[PDB]
Every structure is written in C-alpha cells, then in structure tokens.
Amino acid sequence: ATSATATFAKTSDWGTGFGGSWTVKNTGTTSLSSWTVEWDFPTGTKVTSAWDATVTNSGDHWTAKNVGWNGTLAPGASVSFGFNGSGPGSPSNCKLNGGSCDGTS
Numbered sequence: 001a002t003s004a005t006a007t008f009a010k011t012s013d014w015g016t017g018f019g020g021s022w023t024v025k026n027t028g029t030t031s032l033s034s035w036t037v038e039w040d041f042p043t044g045t046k047v048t049s050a051w052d053a054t055v056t057n058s059g060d061h062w063t064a065k066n067v068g069w070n071g072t073l074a075p076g077a078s079v080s081f082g083f084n085g086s087g088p089g090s091p092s093n094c095k096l097n098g099g100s101c102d103g104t105s
Helices: none
Strands: 003-010 017-027 036-040 047-051 054-058 061-065 076-086 092-096
Touching: 003 092, 047 054, 047 061
Parallel strands: none
Antiparallel strands: 003 017, 017 076, 036 061, 036 092, 047 076, 054 061
C-alpha cells in the first residue's frame, strides 16, 4: 500500500532441491532505484544458483540484488526473480528495502 511490497513463491522442488521464486513490486513510493530483498536462512539452506538476481550469502544471512550497481528504476513497476537452492525451501525474515515486506514475512 503506497510503498514497496514482496511475496514468496514456489517454482519447483526435485527431491532435496527447491526452486525459490520471490516477487518484487515497487508502486506508490517516490522514485525508486534498486530492490534488495534479504532474509534469514536458519534451516539447512543455501542458494546454489540464482538467475535474474545476484543472491549473496554471509554466515547465516542472505540477500538478493539485481540493480545494486546502477540503482535506476521508476517509482512504479513490478519484477520477479527466481533461483535454485539445496534444502527445504522455507525461508523467513523477509525484509527488503531496509526492512519492508507485505503479505508475507
């Protein structure tokens, strides 16, 4: 609502592998620049490969960025990015844009 919102989704899991599908939507807020969605991966999990989004890691915390080098986007738009990780696929602590996430957590 009058801001940036995101939601978690499932792509496809093959036995032990799972396909993460995050949804990013920036509408309402002023002119944007880039979207950075990060979360905590307590349970045995790790993004082995990421597409359309550079997923990084740091100990027990993870983050996903795409325009972290240009940061040039409009105040209104919607984009999604998927990836493949080895584990359950049940991420938590959905915080993006410095602590922001609706319709999920």
